[PDB]
C-alpha cells in the first residue's frame, strides 16, 4: 500500500482499524462513533507517516500538529494522546535519531537490563529516551548477543543473524536508514550438487521441489482438515506428519500397480477361457470334417437320408467355422488390449534413492530455518508466524550485522564481563547479583526498581540454573520455558585468497549421502565482497558436529567443495571459524521454535511480567518488578532480530507506563 495506509502497513498495523492496544489506551474512541475512529486512524497513520518519511530525527508533537490539516488538527488533545501512545510504544522515535528536546535533567526510576543483545539495547535506548536511568549487564565482552560478526583483516562474516527478511513492515527498514548497513539482495538461485559432485539436472530439481511443496501442503491438510494433531497421547510433529504423508504416497504407488496388474490378469483369464473354447471348437470341427468325408464317400445317386447327412454335416461344420472365426476376432482384441496394458504401466516407485536425497536437502533447508529437527516442530503451530511475513527480497548485511547492536549501544551504560547470577525481586524493589566473568569471586550488586530479563531461552532452560530467581519464577512461567523449543544451527566460515565458485550465485546446496546427515554442510553462502564461503550445519547435525574439532569440520567442507569444483581449484583456507551455539553458555542454542506440545501462546506467557508478593503481610499488591524481552517473547515475530527489537520496544513502553504513568490513556 501507499500514502498514510502505507505508513500503517510499514508499522505492522491495519490502516483501517484500531488495534487491541489502541482499544485499551483509547476506549473512549473505539466505544464511540465511527467518525471519531476514522479521525483517530487518520491521525495515527499520518503521524506514522511523518516518522517514517524521516526517521533520522525526533518527531515532536508540535511538529506533528504543525503538519496535520483541518479538521484533524482541530482536536489537539487527541493528536497529543496519539503522538504519545506512538512514542511510548516505539512506533515512532525509536532507534538512533537526533533528539530535538534535550533529555530530562533529572532521571526517574532505575532499571537493570540483563543482556545487551538487540532486545535489551532497544529497550535500554527507549527507557533512557524516556528519562529513566538504565544500566545493562552483559556476560560477554561485547554487545549484540546472537548478532555476532567475525572480523579479521578484510574478512567479515556473521556467525549469528545474517539476513534481513524483507523490508515491507520490517522495523529494520527504519534502522537501516538510521545506521549504515550495507544491505544487498540475495539472488534466490540455488544449484544443488549430489553427494558425488554432479549438479542435479533441472528435470529432477524441479520435480523434487514440487514434491517437497506438496508434501508440506499435505501436512497442513492433515493438520487442519483431518485434525491429525495428536497421535497417541503425544502431540504430532511436522516430522511425523511428513512420514505419514510420504508413506501414503508410497502406498498409492503400490495400490495403483496392484490395480493395473489386476486388469492384466482378468484380461489374461478372459483370453484363457476364450482359447479353451477355441480348442474344443477346433476339436469338434476336426471330428465333423471327418464325418462329412465319411458321408461324402457314399456316392450319388443316393437315398435322401444319406443326402441329408452330407448336407446336414456341411451346415453344422460351416456354423462352427463361423463361430470359431468370431472367437478368433475377439482373441486379437484381447491380445491388443494386453499389448496396451503392458505398454502403459503406472509409475514404478514414489521416489528413487537419488530423489529421496534431494528431498532430504529440502527438508534440511527447513530444519535450517527452524533451527531444529523437524521431529521436534509442532505440526499444528510451527508456521503460526507465517501470516506476518514481510514483503521485499531478503538481504544480507554486508559490512556485518554487528554494525547494528554496536550503534544502538552508543550512549548506554553497559557493564561487560558481568555475568548475572541471581535476580532478587521484592515488594520494595530488586537486587541483581553479578560476578566478573574474568575474575569470578569478585561480586557486584545492583539495586533497582525493575529488572528487564533478556536472557535467551536456552539460558533460562539450563539445568542446573545459570541464573537464580528469588523468589523462584512461578510454574506458569517455568512450564512455558520448558515447553518452548530452543534450537541450534551452526556456521563454518571459510576464508580464501581467491574466489573459485560462481560469483553470480549467492548460494548453493550439497546433497547429503543419508537422511541422518542431511543438515551437515548442506548449504553454502557467498555474500561478502571478500572471498568467503559460509557453510551451514542444520538439523540433527548441528548438535552432533559441536563435538567434532574444527580441523575435521573444515576437512569435510573442502572435500565437498573439491568434489564440486575439482581438487586443483580449492585452496586451503587462510582463516576458519566454526560456531557452536549450543555450547555457548550465554546462548545455549540459536533461536526458539514452536515445539510439539507448545503453542504461540507460550510466547505470550514468556512476555508476561512478574509481580512479587507483599513484604509486610496484608499490604497492598505491589507493582510488577521483573519484565521479560527477547526473541522468545514475541509471538508474531519470534526467532528474529526484528522480533527481538520489537520485544524490547514493547517492554520499554510497558515499564514506562508502569513507573512513569501513562498520561495518554485518559
Amino acid at each position: 500500500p501507499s500514502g498514510v495506509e502505507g505508513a500503517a502497513f510499514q508499522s505492522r498495523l491495519p490502516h483501517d482499524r484500531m488495534t487491541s492496544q489502541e482499544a485499551a489506551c483509547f476506549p473512549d474512541i473505539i466505544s464511540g462513533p465511527q467518525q471519531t475512529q476514522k479521525v483517530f486512524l487518520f491521525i495515527r497513520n499520518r503521524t506514522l507517516q511523518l516518522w517514517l518519511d524521516n526517521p533520522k530525527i525526533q518527531l515532536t508533537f508540535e511538529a506533528t500538529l504543525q503538519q496535520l490539516e483541518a479538521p484533524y488538527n482541530s482536536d489537539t488533545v487527541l493528536v497529543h494522546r496519539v503522538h504519545s501512545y506512538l512514542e511510548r510504544h516505539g512506533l515512532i522515535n525509536f532507534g538512533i535519531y537526533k533528539r530535538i528536546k534535550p533529555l530530562p535533567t533529572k532521571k526517574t526510576g532505575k532499571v537493570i537490563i540483563i543482556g545487551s543483545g538487540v532486545s535489551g539495547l532497544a529497550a535500554a535506548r527507549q527507557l533512557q529516551s524516556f528519562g529513566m536511568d538504565v544500566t545493562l549487564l552483559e556476560a560477554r565482552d561485547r554487545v549484540g548477543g546472537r548478532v555476532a560478526t567475525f572480523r579479521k583483516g578484510n574478512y567479515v562474516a556473521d556467525l549469528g543473524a545474517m539476513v534481513v527478511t524483507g523490508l515491507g513492515g520490517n522495523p529494520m527498514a527504519v534502522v537501516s536508514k538510521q545506521v549504515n548497513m550495507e544491505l544487498a539482495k540475495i539472488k534466490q538461485k540455488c544449484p544443488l550438487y549430489e553427494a558425488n559432485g554432479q549438479a542435479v539436472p533441472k528435470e529432477k530439481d524441479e520435480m523434487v521441489e514440487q514434491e517437497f511443496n506438496r508434501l508440506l501442503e499435505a501436512t497442513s491438510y492433515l493438520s487442519h482438515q483431518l485434525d491429525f494433531n495428536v497421535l497417541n497421547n503425544k502431540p504430532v510433529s511436522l516430522g511425523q506428519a511428513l512420514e505419514v504423508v510420504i508413506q501414503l504416497q508410497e502406498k498409492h504407488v503400490k495400490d495403483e500397480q496392484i490395480e493395473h496388474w489386476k486388469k492384466i490378469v482378468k484380461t489374461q483369464e478372459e483370453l484363457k477361457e476364450l482359447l479353451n473354447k477355441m480348442v474344443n471348437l477346433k476339436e469338434k470341427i476336426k471330428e465333423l470334417h471327418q464325418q462329412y468325408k465319411e458321408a461324402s464317400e457314399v456316392k450319388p445317386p443316393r437315398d435322401i437320408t444319406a443326402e441329408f447327412l452330407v448336407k446336414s454335416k456341411h451346415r453344422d461344420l460351416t456354423a462352427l467355422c463361423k463361430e470359431y472365426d468370431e472367437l478368433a476376432e475377439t482373441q486379437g482384441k484381447l491380445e491388443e488390449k494386453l499389448q496396451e496394458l503392458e505398454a502403459n504401466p503406472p509409475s514404478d516407485v514414489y521416489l528413487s534413492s537419488r530423489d529421496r536425497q534431494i528431498l532430504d536437502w529440502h527438508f534440511a533447508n527447513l530444519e535450517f530455518a527452524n533451527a531444529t529437527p523437524l521431529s521436534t516442530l509442532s505440526l499444528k503451530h510451527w508456521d503460526q508466524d507465517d501470516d506476518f511475513e514481510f514483503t521485499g527480497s531478503h538481504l544480507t548485511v554486508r559490512n556485518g550485522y554487528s554494525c547494528v547492536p554496536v550503534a544502538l549501544a552508543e550512549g548506554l551504560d553497559i557493564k561487560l564481563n558481568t555475568a548475572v547470577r541471581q535476580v532478587r525481586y521484592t515488594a520494595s524493589g530488586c537486587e541483581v547479583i553479578a560476578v566478573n566473568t574474568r575474575s569470578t569471586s569478585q561480586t557486584f550488586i545492583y539495586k533497582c526498581d525493575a529488572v528487564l530479563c533478556t536472557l535467551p531461552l536456552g539460558v533460562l532452560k539450563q539445568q542446573p540454573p545459570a541464573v537464580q530467581f528469588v523468589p523462584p519464577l512461578p510454574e506458569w512461567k517455568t512450564s512455558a520455558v520448558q515447553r518452548m523449543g530452543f534450537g541450534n544451527l551452526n556456521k563454518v566460515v571459510l576464508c580464501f585468497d581467491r574466489v573459485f565458485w560462481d560469483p553470480s550465485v549467492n548460494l548453493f546446496g550439497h546433497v547429503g549421502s543419508t537422511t541422518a546427515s542431511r543438515g551437515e554442510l548442506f548449504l553454502f553462502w557467498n555474500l561478502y565482497k571478500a572471498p568467503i564461503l559460509l557453510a551451514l550445519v542444520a538439523g540433527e547435525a548441528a548438535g552432533i558436529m559441536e563435538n567434532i574439532s574444527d580441523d575435521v569440520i573444515v576437512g569435510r567442507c573442502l572435500a565437498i567443495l573439491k568434489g564440486i569444483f575439482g581438487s586443483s581449484a580449492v585452496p586451503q583456507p587462510k582463516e576458519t571459524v566454526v560456531s557452536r551455539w549450543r555450547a555457548d553458555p550465554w546462548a545455549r542454542g540459536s533461536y526458539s521454535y514452536v515445539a510439539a506440545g507448545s503453542s504461540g501462546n507460550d510466547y505470550d506467557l514468556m512476555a508476561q511480567p512478574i509481580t512479587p508478593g507483599p513484604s509486610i503481610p496484608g499490604a497492598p499488591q505491589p507493582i510488577p518488578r521483573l519484565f521479560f524481552a527477547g526473541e522468545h517473547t514475541i509471538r508474531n515475530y519470534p526467532a528474529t532480530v526484528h522480533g527481538a527489537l520489537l520485544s524490547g520496544l514493547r517492554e520499554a513502553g510497558r515499564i514506562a507506563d508502569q513507573f512513569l504513568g501513562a498520561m495518554y490513556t485518559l
Binding site: 504423508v245 503400490k254 448336407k311 460351416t318 456354423a319
Partner: protein
Amino acid sequence: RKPPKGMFLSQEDVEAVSANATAATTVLRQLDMELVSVKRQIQNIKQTNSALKEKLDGGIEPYRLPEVIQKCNARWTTEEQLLAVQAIRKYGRDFQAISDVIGNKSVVQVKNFFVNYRRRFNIDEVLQEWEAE
C-alpha cells in the same frame, strides 16, 4: 477441504498407517505380497495361454468347406420336402439351419412349409420327437 493435486490422503488410510509404530511398514509389506503374487499369477496364465495357442497352430484352414451359393426358388421338389422333414427332426424350429440345409429355400419359405404340410408331414409329431431329445 481438498488435499493438493496428486496427493492421496483419506481419513481411513491415515488411521491405518498411524495405528502402530510398525503398522506403516505392515500395510506396505502386504502390498508387496499382493503385488508379487499377482505378477506370479500372470506368469502362469501367460505360459498356460501360450500352450493353448500352440495347440491351435494351423488355424482351422484344413477343415473349411466351400460355400454353396444357390439362389432361392419357389418350387418345392420332393427332394427338398424330404430334406425339410429331416432337418426339422434334427433342428426343431431353427428355421435358419433348416434353410441352410435345403440350400435353395429362404427362412420365410420354410415357415410357410411348416403350415402347408403340417397335416401331411405330421410336423407336430416330428417336432415332439425333436423335443424329446
